Amino acid sequence: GEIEFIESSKDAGFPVINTPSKTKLEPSVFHQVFEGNKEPAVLRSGDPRLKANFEEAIFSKYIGNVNTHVDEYMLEAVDHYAGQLATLDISTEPMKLEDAVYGTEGLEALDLTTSAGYPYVALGIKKRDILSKKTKDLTKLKECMDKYGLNLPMVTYVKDELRSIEKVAKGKSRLIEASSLNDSVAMRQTFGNLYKTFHLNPGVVTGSAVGCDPDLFWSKIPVMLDGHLIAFDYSGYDASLSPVWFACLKMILEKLGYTHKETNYIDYLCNSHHLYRDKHYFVRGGMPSGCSGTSIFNSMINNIIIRTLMLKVYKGIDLDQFRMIAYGDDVIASYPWPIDASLLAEAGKGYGLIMTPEVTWTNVTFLKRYFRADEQYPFLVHPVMPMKDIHESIRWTKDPKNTQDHVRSLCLLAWHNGEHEYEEFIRKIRSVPVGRCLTLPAFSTLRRKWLDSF
């Protein structure tokens, strides 16, 4: 992706988008009890922690585009992945508006807490002024969609999150795009059934882990990926994507039965108009992370990409014995023969991608978690989030009113590191008075509930 044009919003008649001064992240009561290095991402240009220019840094992920046709390797990659997806009988019929907005099996209700986007943010209109969980009303939504239409600009926000010392100093904060509510809804109607099928079928047929529950899914992964492991992620995957990969996505969607007109929303993702505070800009290429479906679409494109690279480097590869699962840019995969991931990575460079790869079940990670087979039940596999990362999270909060849920959710991650680690974690939590006010689950209880969940 590449920013093709940027100028002051006022010159186009767009108002300034008022986004936040300060981080919502503050040190928690556990800040001194546990150790960590991460701090809130830089949100503004004058952050005294910066050792770089902020606006340049946040837009530096748009590294450019490789201008190329859909080549023979892409075409074969698309055909092979489309054949897998055909198995799932994905309906290209539009999803019912009430289902696409307020919830159906496999597609959670539209998040009412996030930005409604443009023009609503300029008018003070929030998602809750249009939608109602209690009443499931659609009449106000239909009015706003009729009034403002589709293909509206996106609103760029800086993601308020913990980051490493280096990413704070370099100002490499992440950016999230808010689609207009009108566009989010229309895409959920157009692609809702695809979304549902992916959410209900994580694994090596979708090649997707979006929406998975690591507590359950981790034990299935080594059954699915039974060859020599291949794994990597990327540097700046979303913004690196060139338009040819979106062309590949449209071809795969058409093979699934979507009409050319129904794939038009992929053009909306690829060639996009953004408002960022007092500026507006156009981008060619790049997945606009945060719009409807970007994790699933990122994952589907990654399935095309890896097949492309394998076909191009290993002419004579048999993709029917290749297996892969992607969550956006994050890939875990296997093939019955050893594969040099560095050759794939260098081939990917030729397509404008920055890929970063004996990968074993001991050292492989997926979704920032390790895999450890249970000592007693060898066919069950623990997702292992490093205690380091659990410690980083517990030291901060965006709202101490949620301390109980926050620490509870961390306990659900932590116990997979084993009983000694877990008791130490619980011990340190209880060394603060708040910690003795929390309902903390017992290790035996977590282990028992986990075993029983299978």
UniProtKB/TrEMBL annotation:
Protease 3C: Major viral protease that mediates proteolytic processing of the polyprotein. Cleaves host EIF5B, contributing to host translation shutoff. Cleaves also host PABPC1, contributing to host translation shutoff. It comes from Coxsackievirus B3. It is found in: Host cytoplasmic vesicle membrane; Host nucleus; Virion. It comes from the Viruses. Residues 227-343 form the RdRp catalytic domain. This is Genome polyprotein. Belongs to the picornaviruses polyprotein family. Homohexamer; forms a hexameric ring structure with 6-fold symmetry characteristic of AAA+ ATPases. Interacts (via N-terminus) with host RTN3 (via reticulon domain); this interaction is important for viral replication. Interacts with capsid protein VP3; this interaction may be important for virion morphogenesis. Interacts with Viral protein genome-linked and with protein 3CD. Mg(2+) binds at D233, D330.
